Design a protein around this ligand. Structure first.
Ligand code: MET
Length: 521
């Protein structure tokens, strides 16, 4: 039977553009989702904009527009960037939605009646040296407007009631769940620092003015953005189930759920997804996630992204100059099971993509297709010129799937390009361009280029989750139904091809520099 898989990515904040560092997470997630879809599994990919908090109030104020105005414009822009980068969500919702308002309040109310909510007064005191108000830890709250000394009648001591999630109530459960396999060992041991220290109650309320959901029965008190943000996951899925009759909420979020749930996140936000989130789900009556998939961050030419050096590239700025599949492949070629950083070496970016994709994959196709087109009216002739070469492709497939399954895209691209390298070399060894000029060798020409195109179909199957647009164009040329992973098991013989679709041009280094220049501020 197929696997039911609900996959999410972190919800970007609704206060700025998506940049190429953010894009690494969504490309990682989308590629994994597309692979599971090819494998015949029910993989559902949901995300949303994170539209609350002082983060949004600051930008809304900085631009003289309302908070609703900003997040609406921003959600449109984020969805356009993701879509153009071929990141295909099943739903892209918003933490500022009626589903999130009800889910947050229903979860809160259940947790409260179970005794997992606490009320205590937080004190803030003015520090004359640091010249600002500090919180009573026993840091300051994030500012909501743009803005000190001890004034005569001005208080030096604020106080306000806050609402706490009694996270320590789940410490035993969390001590077990964090080491259950849901986290990679590196992740679990870095996270366990909070556990070694002892969990603390979590401040989930903010005072007015705050752009967010109001807390039931606490007038003037709002949920902190990080309280409702992960509930955006459930909200995004609940909103989707209204339009997808085959998707049942309880089937994915009930404690009994036999479905898998994965959160792709960056390493900076593990504590929210690994401590508060699974405690919240268990206390509220839902299943905990199957695993967190944690990733590192992006560097460009060996250094941190620089707005001054022009290596802090907006997704739209990339898309103005370059094919998105360039970057999708480059990321795939370095994305690993680990949690390390990933470097975009711009010179290596051009050499690697041109040599691997255009050179080893696209050119095997266009060269061979031309001979089938001109020499046999476009009918691919079936033959067995190089059985050992073909068997290698068969032997390699389940391993490439294992890499995909385990998020080891690096290994997967490696295995694929090794097959590409070997197939390409055999074609060159045959030299159909030379056989085509010899009289009485036309059968040989079609035998060779038939295998060539067959192997290109195999490479497209293997690369489809990285290059879904290229795959679509390839399926048009190959004149086949959309490719499943199981299609690798069959071959085209005696098959009418369509005209050759353009698949990918080389990366022009001028365009890469034009992208960097456009990003210098
Ligand atoms: C529920 S995931 C929230 C992610 C958060 N908005 C961030 O950008 O770090």
């Amino acid at each position: 039977e197929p696997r039911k898989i609900l996959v999410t990515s972190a919800l970007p904040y609704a206060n700025g553009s998506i940049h190429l560092g953010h894009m690494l997470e969504y490309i990682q997630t989308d590629m994994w989702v597309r692979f599971q879809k090819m494998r015949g599994n029910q993989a559902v990919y949901v995300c949303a904009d994170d539209a609350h908090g002082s983060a949004i109030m600051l930008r809304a104020e900085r631009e003289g527009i309302t908070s609703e105005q900003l997040i609406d414009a921003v959600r449109a822009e984020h969805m356009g960037d993701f879509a153009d980068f071929l990141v295909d969500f099943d739903n892209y919702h918003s933490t500022h939605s009626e589903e999130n308002r009800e889910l947050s309040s229903a979860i809160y109310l259940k947790l409260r009646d179970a005794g997992h909510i606490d009320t205590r007064p937080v004190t803030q005191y003015f520090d004359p040296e640091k010249q600002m108000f500090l919180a009573d830890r026993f840091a300051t709250y994030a500012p909501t407007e743009l803005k000190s000394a001890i004034s005569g009648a001005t208080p030096v001591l604020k106080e306000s009631l806050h609402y706490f999630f009694k996270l320590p109530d789940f410490e035993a459960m969390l001590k077990q769940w964090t080491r259950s396999g849901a986290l990679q060992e590196s992740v679990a041991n870095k996270l366990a620092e909070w556990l070694d220290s002892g969990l603390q109650q979590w401040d989930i309320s903010r005072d007015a003015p705050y752009f967010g959901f109001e807390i039931p029965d606490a007038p003037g008190k709002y949920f902190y953005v990080w309280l409702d943000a992960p509930i955006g996951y459930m909200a995004s899925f609940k909103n989707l189930c209204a339009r997808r009759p085959e998707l049942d909420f309880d089937a994915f979020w009930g404690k009994d759920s036999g479905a898998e749930l994965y959160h792709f996140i960056g390493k900076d936000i593990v504590n929210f997804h690994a401590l508060f989130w699974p405690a919240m789900l268990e206390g509220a009556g839902y299943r905990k996630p199957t695993a967190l998939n944690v990733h590192g961050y992006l560097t460009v030419n060996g250094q941190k992204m620089s707005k001054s050096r022009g290596t802090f590239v907006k997704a739209r700025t990339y898309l103005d100059h370059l094919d998105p599949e360039y970057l999708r492949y480059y990321y795939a070629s370095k994305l690993g099971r680990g949690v390390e950083d990933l470097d975009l070496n711009l010179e290596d970016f051009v050499q690697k993509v041109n040599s691997d994709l255009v050179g080893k994959v696209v050119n095997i196709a266009s060269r061979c297709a031309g001979f089938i087109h001109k020499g046999n009216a476009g009918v691919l002739v079936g033959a067995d010129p190089a059985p050992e070469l073909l068997a290698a492709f068969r032997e390699a497939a389940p391993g490439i799937a294992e890499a995909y399954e385990a998020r080891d895209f690096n290994r997967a691209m490696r295995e694929i390009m090794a097959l590409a390298d070997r197939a390409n070399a055999w074609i060159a060894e045959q030299a159909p361009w030379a056989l085509a000029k010899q009289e009485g060798q036309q059968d040989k020409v079609q035998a060779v280029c038939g295998l060539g195109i067959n192997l290109f179909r195999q490479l497209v199957i293997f690369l489809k989750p990285v290059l879904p647009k290229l795959a679509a164009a390839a399926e048009a040329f190959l004149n086949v139904a959309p490719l499943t992973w199981a299609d690798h098991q069959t071959l085209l013989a005696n098959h009418q091809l369509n005209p050759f679709q353009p698949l990918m041009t080389r990366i022009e280094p001028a365009k890469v520099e034009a992208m960097i220049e456009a990003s210098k501020e």
